[PDB]
């Protein structure tokens, strides 16, 4: 049958000591709540009811394009109250899964088991075994069913030894939720309407609740502060790295690798220590990434080596190119096959054609460079003082001598040769040689401070 | 009552294989002994007696400004002998705490408990529970008192199972120390005067010794070699990072963060992987530090982003500034609000005014730059060959074209415009445009090696 | 008696998802099989029989200079079959040790114990204690001898509890191997000729097999995929770092240090976080390496500081030199004593004499620079457009003003002085001052876009 999700995300997150609400803090570059939404979506959720409250404005700006039902909870009177805000929108005969916006590691596969285990008119409850279950409600199994969740202060001696514990994530049909939520009270030390009480209410109705253990403890872990969040981050990165290693990516040290987005890869890819991969990155076969590199939204072709301490964003690199070390590709950098970009070089919004080299101490911006060009050390594309940023066009087989300033807008045609120390403001023709006539004063017998 | 400390720091540290004495090796950028001195000071110690010996000269040069009594122990005849060197300076009715210069992680809070537990005319002894106590003297409790410390080779079968062990750190009043130290002998396998024997001597006098367990084992851990020192370092950094995370600083990976000094911070600070913070650093609200950055003695204002692989020392950065990646601020760099410093830029002992940008391949040294200036790619401030390093003064709203050499001393007044490829040796006036007249030779039909 | 080794290395390594065969994947920059070969050599092996098959061509190109007997196994019919391929070459009265090309951490010291324990006409079998031995053949000791290796599916209840397990590495004399290998059958679920069966065959002959436990479990661990390989890598680096720390090298964080080759060092060497050492590196006394540095095949003299994010390859650095941060030494860089190389500087195949400084934004290639020179910011050595790369010769006590282009081939004699913004194409004489005569246009009252 159909499925929808409710995600509890209204919390202030006081112990984060932040201007943001609890669930907006990122794991691997994405808000915690976004992880949970995505997981709900790939589960097949038809609707996703997002219970929000604190930092409402920020939730709306940060998650503006999310396909969720925005359910504003004006006061946090308990998890049952929270879910009840969305209950009018539950279809009677759809399953509903309740998830928490501050528990981002929960997997599709665990939630599929949970949903599959749910008996008709009953509940499937996700539990977890802890080594120290102190403080948490103990699962009481009679036969293969949960008959009680006994809190810390009520448990007798033997019940205290139970390691199976309640996570609060559960599945039931919409009609059952509507019925039981109306029966939850707040007669307890905290004065709150707890979703937990649905288990007792289900048992009152002679309805079955079945326990499903989560395989991994960290899966169901929340973060109330940034220390806990950093542990979740590390668990997430390790799991991402392990998957990549098992797919055949050589990662020299998985504890020193960060993926913040998606990585598509070929075979025999080698990624050295302290690399960060951000947004959507695609690497071909035999790509080697040296230590310290940062790649954000890039496509790298087969057989490319990126040497250490290179930073690339919104860029495309063709096969057999060589980049680095200390290279910078800024958005719109498009390097063709067999290009060479070297140390202390910055390329911005420019195309560089096949075989061309830009190997030292150079800025190329808003430019088109053709094939088999030689851009010397110290070359700079610049503009006049004024308005917009105009274009430099360099054709094929051009030599640009070291320390040349190319003053846009200007065009240098095929086969041209420009001498070192030149300032180019006028168009250079095909097969034109331009050299600077220097005037020098030579003084003999100049003794330096000895 | 009053308190003073004795710190044992005379050891050669042979297994460090170093020219330095044992306690001078650093943890988080500070000599191990300096950690212990600081802790003794914040404990409220009136005097701090530093027992030193090996590497005496180096101890004096490295710790010249420390407020300690320099007690030179000519021969290491045992820990009791060491403490006895300082005993003439103990006040009869002050408490004395004995600490070790090679155990830098001991905390104020543990030492406060220890001092509080000390019975009148008695001793408080710091103990620790080990899982493998082999080799260490076992604490023998009869009632709530220590009656013996039984060494490895003397313990019977059941005493060998005791996990509580002697650390050697202890508190007693000055008069008691003077009395008992005179009674310590060296009749043992090593021929040494052990401070340990004070427990036996106290019991002989019908004086009470009380055990106080250290909460954390690493707290009381010493370092005899650099492997052990690296473990202490890692424990220290983890503890520093955890504190920061609990105060609301987002540290992407606490195992890849180093603090070597003090960090003051606002809210919503984000610190990426592999950052090093040195000396005194102050970060405002919403500061983002990218991967690989090194900040030593800097003040960073609100809303500043430092992009990856930037190195900053002795510098000030105003609010909303943007630095990096690959930027270098050397001592005396002062960047105003809303400034921009980009890749492969070095700024030394210079002020840069509000809104100004220095975005590529540039060296600015000994300069004053005003507000809303545009310093082009390839610009260099330089001096004549000779003596001292003179100043370049650039006013407000100045455009400096790419690859300009500014030859100090020189002044460029408000609103001036300098063309690319220029050498400025003479003062430029207000609203003066200076462009270089190039002479070029153009040769048509120059065929390059095809 | 004499010794030879057999190394099993024929495997395809399907789960690496690579074009390379299993054993060619690197640990610390060297193929796994190369580790095992080296270990066999330092053990004193007279012959090393390398059983190879899959990726044969790549094995030959990658290991072309290895002193091994190339034994091509056309089909992998089991470990006994593999060893039998080399058996015709075993000397009757030499010991033979069988090792695996995908288990690179096995040590000389463990293998020496194994060989020493081998009884005459018997076998010494390397075993290991696992906490979860499920799936592995259990060692059955009767007295001090192995009488059976009982596989998982045959073991009774009590045998399943045995933690001692078979590794497959073993030593026996050549004659015994020849005899027993001919008697191994393939009557089993997998249809393979297992080397394991030698233990049963030895017992049939009333020959003694003795177990020798490996001290470290990781020692005998293989890698079937890149996840397992990364764990081996991390174990290896940690062990290398621990050895260095115990020799007196200060490594700020051993988990963030990589050695890929050999390191020779003096005393009081300090290596900050995230350093990579490759090939053969030699560091003198008091060398400090800052964070992020990469050193490949370099010699560094006493008292050199390399500041953060410097990359050095095939270079020599004299005593008291200062490099970095953000410096690049490319192959053939030779820096004399007391030199200074600064940020965004690239030096390639050049000698730089004593006391000389090259501190910013500079490329020096194919050059000789003498002593006490001052190479200004923005200086570039370049060539004419044409063929080979010619040499720039700068003598002693030369000042080269900022942004000078030195156009090879050219010579600048002792004591010469070159002004900023100069293009040098002609030889400069001793004590010659060369300054550029600029022509500038000055326009007063030029109002910039306000
Ligand atoms: O009324 C509530 C109660 C709890 N929760 C969320 O559910 C999680 C578990 O209590 C917490 O993160 C909390 O913010 C809310 O969204 N609304
Ligand atoms: O006579 C001594 C004996 C020991 N200690 C120090 O006390 C510590 C514990 O023995 C060691 O680090 C040692 O250097 C000294 O300063 N003087
Ligand atoms: O016939 C064989 C059987 C196994 N092995 C190698 O021995 C190791 C243990 O089976 C594996 O890595 C496998 O590749 C081979 O070289 N030849």
PDB file of C-alpha atoms in Angstrom, chain C residues 102 155 209 263 269-270 284 330 388 403 427 429 443:
ATOM      1  CA  UNK C 102      48.877 -10.108  -1.244  1.00  0.00           C
ATOM      2  CA  UNK C 155      34.894 -29.162  13.478  1.00  0.00           C
ATOM      3  CA  UNK C 209      54.857 -30.167  12.214  1.00  0.00           C
ATOM      4  CA  UNK C 263      63.735   8.396   5.780  1.00  0.00           C
ATOM      5  CA  UNK C 269      63.646  16.847  13.687  1.00  0.00           C
ATOM      6  CA  UNK C 270      60.092  18.193  13.838  1.00  0.00           C
ATOM      7  CA  UNK C 284      69.781  16.640   9.095  1.00  0.00           C
ATOM      8  CA  UNK C 330      61.371  20.866  -9.053  1.00  0.00           C
ATOM      9  CA  UNK C 388      65.821  23.787 -26.501  1.00  0.00           C
ATOM     10  CA  UNK C 403      59.566  41.981 -12.558  1.00  0.00           C
ATOM     11  CA  UNK C 427      75.071  39.988 -21.256  1.00  0.00           C
ATOM     12  CA  UNK C 429      79.086  43.136 -17.296  1.00  0.00           C
ATOM     13  CA  UNK C 443      47.037  63.244 -17.995  1.00  0.00           C
TER      14      UNK C 443
END
